Amino acid sequence: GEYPTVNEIPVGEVRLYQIADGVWSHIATQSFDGAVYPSNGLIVRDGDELLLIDTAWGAKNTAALLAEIEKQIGLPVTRAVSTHFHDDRVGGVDVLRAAGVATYASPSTRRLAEAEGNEIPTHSLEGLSSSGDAVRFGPVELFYPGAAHSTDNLVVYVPSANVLYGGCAVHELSSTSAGNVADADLAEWPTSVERIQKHYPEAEVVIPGHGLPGGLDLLQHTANVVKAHKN
């Protein structure tokens, strides 16, 4: 019942965590440049179907995610959104697409994924190209806060439950560093976080791209660690 960590997640298996009624996170682990990392995604019930947010970081992890969803929830995943272009968000899109899931991302994410050699979601999400933009997608709202962890990062809000999924633009409270910042805009990131804070002041659960969910404090903490990283 505690939030899963790598010490309970061998690379290749996936765990789900119930966040609220009809909202789960998914947690998987992956190795990258010789270190092991956890990463989160989201599952949101969409009537008798499910909307998936982000892959489980890899083809085999994403196959394991689909099997875990079938075991624990038993409703079909019909659509998936990837919230930026890195492999913890799109790696596994080919698995999803061969399992009949329609895969979506912003045009910016699709272009960056293609240029990087990462898997490419099929469908483009328009209406998200300017910071502050929001669109509805099934039971969620997608929001583009501006450049942060990456120039294309999206956040996801579940209005029925006041769940804010920040993705990799939001870090967990225990973080001491701003993660992998190679594609980040450290100067713009606090402004983008401020936009999230202004847009979703009633969020009750905030889920980072990696690590433990918490409350709204994750947003200010993220701004703090980014500003200190920059400096």
Ligand SMILES: C[C@H](Oc1ccc(CN)cc1)c1cccc2c(-c3ccc(CS(C)(=O)=O)c(F)c3)c(C(=O)O)[nH]c12
């Ligand atoms: C999936 C991502 O791939 C790449 C990212 C950039 C590039 C540049 N061409 C190439 C590959 C990736 C690969 C490996 C690690 C990461 C991390 C990361 C790193 C450290 C922490 C602990 S912390 C906040 O306390 O420092 C953390 F939570 C997350 C993140 C993220 O920050 O989103 N992305 C990661």
Ligand SMILES: [Zn+2]
């Ligand atoms: Zn990333």
Ligand SMILES: [Zn+2]
């Ligand atoms: Zn990440």
